[PDB]
Amino acid sequence: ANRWLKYVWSPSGYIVHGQIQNYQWNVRPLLEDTSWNSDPLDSVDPDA
Amino acid sequence: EDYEIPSSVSSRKDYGWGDYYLSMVYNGDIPTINYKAASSDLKIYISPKLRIIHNGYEGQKRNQCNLMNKYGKLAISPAKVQIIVKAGGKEQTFTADKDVSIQPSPSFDEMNYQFNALEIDGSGLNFINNSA
């Protein structure tokens, strides 16, 4: 379970092509969008 | 690749006095060292501290800095407080106006600039007989 969670997030970071990376989030939009949105999405779906 | 790096280093290889022999850098330190190795990479995190004491050169110069120190208050520009490192062939510079969150107050007795973490590229570290 730990190994699989690491495909999304690693607090210790990642190694790519032997290089030490400077990020923890391995999903581009989670790495990006570091700011909370302000105005909420007006919906009924928590997934949206 | 087992990289054996000490967790702290306190020793000196060289030393200099300021331009007018009025003040000097005081035995500072490298209170902590952290690192991560990988095939084809090495990142070393050094969190050093820069210390200044207004001690002049031994002789009448030490006595003159004492007359200064005891009869007034300090100055020193944090933007020009810096640590320069060379890992093998790679040069990096870090400054106290970026990597130090709290600056020391002005004083002639002592000032201490504690750097948070200096991320240094060790891939340029050249090993001879497995030592660098």
Q: Which residues make Cβ contacts (< 8 Å) with residue A18, sequence separation at least 6? A: B38, B39, B40, B41
Facing residues of B43 across strands? B36, B121
Q: Which two tokens stand for residue A13?
A: 């970071």
**Which residues in chain B have their CB less than 8 angstroms from residue A17's CB?**
40
Name the residue with tokens 């501290």: B49
The angle subtended at Cα B49 by Cα B48 and Cα B53, nearest 5°, is: 150
**Which residues in chain A have their CB less than 8 angstroms from residue B124's CB?**
none
Q: How far apart are CA B58 and CA B55, in angstroms?
A: 8
Interface of A with B (CB under 8 A): 15, 17-20
CB-CB contact of B72 with B42 (8 Å): no
Facing residues of B24 across strands? B17, B53
**CB-based burial of residue B120 (10 Å sphere; 0-12 exposed, 13-18 middle, 19+ buried)?**
buried
CB-CB contact of B22 with B98 (8 Å): no
Facing residues of A19 across strands? A16
- Residue A2 dihedral angles phi and psi, to the nearest 5°: -60, -50
**Which residues in chain B have their CB less than 8 angstroms from residue A20's CB?**
36, 38, 41-43
CB-CB contact of B97 with B90 (8 Å): no
Q: Where are the alpha helices (DSSP H) in A1-48?
A: 2-5, 28-31
CB contact under 8 A, A18 and B41: yes
CB-CB contact of B50 with B115 (8 Å): yes
Q: Which of B98, B92, B83, B94 shows the shortest CA–CA distance to B123?
A: B92
DSSP 8-state assignment for residue B126: P
CB-CB contact of B71 with B86 (8 Å): no
DSSP B86-107: EETTEEEEEEHHHH-SSPPPP-
Count Cβ neighbours within 10 Å for each residue of A13-37 and write b for 16 or more, e otherwise. Answer: ebbeeeebeeeebbeeeeeeeeeee
Facing residues of B41 across strands? B38
- Edge-to-edge, what's the strand order for the sheet holding B111-114? B24-29, B49-53, B111-114
Q: How many CB atoms lie within 10 A of CB B112?
A: 16
DSSP 8-state assignment for residue B62: H
Handedness of CA B58, B61, B64, B70 (dihedral sign): negative
Residue B88 C-alpha, separation from nearest chain A C-alpha, in angstroms: 18
Q: Resolution to 1 decimal, in Å?
A: 3.4
